[PDB]
Amino acid sequence: GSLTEDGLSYKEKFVVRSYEVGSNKTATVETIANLLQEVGCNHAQSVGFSTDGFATTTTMRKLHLIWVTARMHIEIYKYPAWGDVVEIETWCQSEGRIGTRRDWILKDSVTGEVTGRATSKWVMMNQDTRRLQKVSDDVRDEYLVFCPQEPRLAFPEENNRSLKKIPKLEDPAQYSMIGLKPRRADLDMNQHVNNVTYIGWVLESIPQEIVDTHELQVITLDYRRECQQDDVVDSLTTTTSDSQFLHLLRLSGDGQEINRGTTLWRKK
Amino acid sequence: GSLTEDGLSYKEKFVVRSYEVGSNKTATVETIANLLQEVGCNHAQSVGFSTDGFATTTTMRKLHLIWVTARMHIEIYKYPAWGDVVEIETWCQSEGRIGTRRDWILKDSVTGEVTGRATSKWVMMNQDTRRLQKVSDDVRDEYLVFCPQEPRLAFPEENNRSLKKIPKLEDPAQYSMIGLKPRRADLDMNQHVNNVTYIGWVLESIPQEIVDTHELQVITLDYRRECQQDDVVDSLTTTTSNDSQFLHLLRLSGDGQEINRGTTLWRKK
Numbered sequence A: 001g002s003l004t005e006d007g008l009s010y011k012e013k014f015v016v017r018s019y020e021v022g023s024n025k026t027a028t029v030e031t032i033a034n035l036l037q038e039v040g041c042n043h044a045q046s047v048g049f050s051t052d053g054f055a056t057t058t059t060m061r062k063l064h065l066i067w068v069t070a071r072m073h074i075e076i077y078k079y080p081a082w083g084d085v086v087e088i089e090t091w092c093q094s095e096g097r098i099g100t101r102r103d104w105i106l107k108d109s110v111t112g113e114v115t116g117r118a119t120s121k122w123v124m125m126n127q128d129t130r131r132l133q134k135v136s137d138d139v140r141d142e143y144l145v146f147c148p149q150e151p152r153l154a155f156p157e158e159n160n161r162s163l164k165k166i167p168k169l170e171d172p173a174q175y176s177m178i179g180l181k182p183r184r185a186d187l188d189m190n191q192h193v194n195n196v197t198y199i200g201w202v203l204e205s206i207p208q209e210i211v212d213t214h215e216l217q218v219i220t221l222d223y224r225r226e227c228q229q230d231d232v233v234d235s236l237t238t239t240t241s242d243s244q245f246l247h248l249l250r251l252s253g254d255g256q257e258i259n260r261g262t263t264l265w266r267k268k
Numbered sequence B: 001g002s003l004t005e006d007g008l009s010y011k012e013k014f015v016v017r018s019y020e021v022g023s024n025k026t027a028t029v030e031t032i033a034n035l036l037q038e039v040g041c042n043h044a045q046s047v048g049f050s051t052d053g054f055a056t057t058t059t060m061r062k063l064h065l066i067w068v069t070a071r072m073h074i075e076i077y078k079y080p081a082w083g084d085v086v087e088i089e090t091w092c093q094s095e096g097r098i099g100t101r102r103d104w105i106l107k108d109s110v111t112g113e114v115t116g117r118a119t120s121k122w123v124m125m126n127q128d129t130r131r132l133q134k135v136s137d138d139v140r141d142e143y144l145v146f147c148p149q150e151p152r153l154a155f156p157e158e159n160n161r162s163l164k165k166i167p168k169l170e171d172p173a174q175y176s177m178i179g180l181k182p183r184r185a186d187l188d189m190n191q192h193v194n195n196v197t198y199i200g201w202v203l204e205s206i207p208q209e210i211v212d213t214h215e216l217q218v219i220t221l222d223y224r225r226e227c228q229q230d231d232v233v234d235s236l237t238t239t240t241s242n243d244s245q246f247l248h249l250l251r252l253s254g255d256g257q258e259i260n261r262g263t264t265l266w267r268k269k
């Protein structure tokens, strides 16, 4: 991979692996999300930021501050097949003291056709207290020189799917998968549950008949609280409709919300 | 990747990814096992066999026959760090009507030093009845031209660890992790649990204090029965031992049916 000519974005190509595909012999949405995280990490490394998923500066590390994902939104038009080469371009853009956006565009390397796009909202938090704090005009200045200054959006329209408010699923759920728990492979280098694991947990409560007859076109997922390595999660889903679903992940015992989301599926 | 000059082995290089590493910022043993499966699949593709993990011929597919892993044995000297390039060479060799072996050598791409090695034993089975059968001359003949004919072993040593018999862990286990179940990411393209998932389940019952102060040097794992996508598994471990050694058993949560047994050897950091 490499920074582009203007140095304000990063591109990398990936060959889809045998263990990365689902029953259609094409990449799963979790494989796509792992590749989005990989190119985001390589972009941080290319310019000197931390490579632990938090993309921090030396000053943020002295203050115990990190960037954390509040929302992930992914839209896929065509999943790449096993052995196909997919090229992913990514960039960041500040959205004021509230937070920052990282966007991605996925392309078929042979045709140059756009096969998917994604956007994510990040907030700054103290890693120990978990309290959010607005971005200072000294931390912000460190990042501005690596971002485009004119708006560059993977989802340009005023109020498109990526910005829609997500309601809270009400009991009883139509479908559920309970007692889900992370194993060591689900953790990152810091022993935290990887953001992609929550996507897998959301999808566990979609009926197998939908997965067999449909393809996932859009997934929007809010992150409210972490699942600790010793927590247990319940995944709940209700049809709201193409087929559309509302999703909720909550801790198995007291029912504390950890994530909410929606998915849209197209018939094959 | 590519077949080598003599066409009897296959080589491929991989750059270690950010999500592929553990707490030491080096590749996990599950990442290594996934790369061993990837290069095995690319080797099958390169010569025309199936690319579904079973490496079958047209004749085997007509007979509903597949190759299945009976044992996996991995020894790692140095785990590659994030961003490092590891080169893996793999080849197969028949061991008579009983089955076949696939071996692998892992090297540091910059230095050329051997950083790990692995071997696996495969048997032929009917995919529907699950009955094993001795390899026929007509099936074996299809494979012989892609394998070295003189012995080529990743583990040549006299009574090496890769061939040792594994005993059955007796209750009570010293440690356990109960109620493990696969999710869709644990399945392959044919909706079967990926062989690497069982390695992860075996390691779930190793105490975190061992993982934090030791590195996994050797893992030997026998595969006796599949965990179905709707089954639940219990992972049991007992210390058998500076080095620490463990005996492992995976069994179905309800009736206690064995699915895997294994051993691990760990060296203090």
Ligand SMILES: OCc1cc(-c2ccccc2)on1
Binding pocket: A043, A044, A047, A049, A055, A067, A092, A093, A094, A100, A140, A143, A144, A146, A147
């Ligand atoms: O303010 C957060 C942020 C992070 C980045 C970034 C830019 C380039 C590479 C990696 C991270 O830009 N803004």
Ligand SMILES: OCc1cc(-c2ccccc2)on1
Binding pocket: B043, B044, B047, B049, B055, B067, B092, B093, B094, B099, B100, B140, B143, B144, B146, B147
């Ligand atoms: O007898 C089983 C077997 C499988 C293979 C093989 C050789 C080359 C590539 C893929 C598979 O060789 N022997």
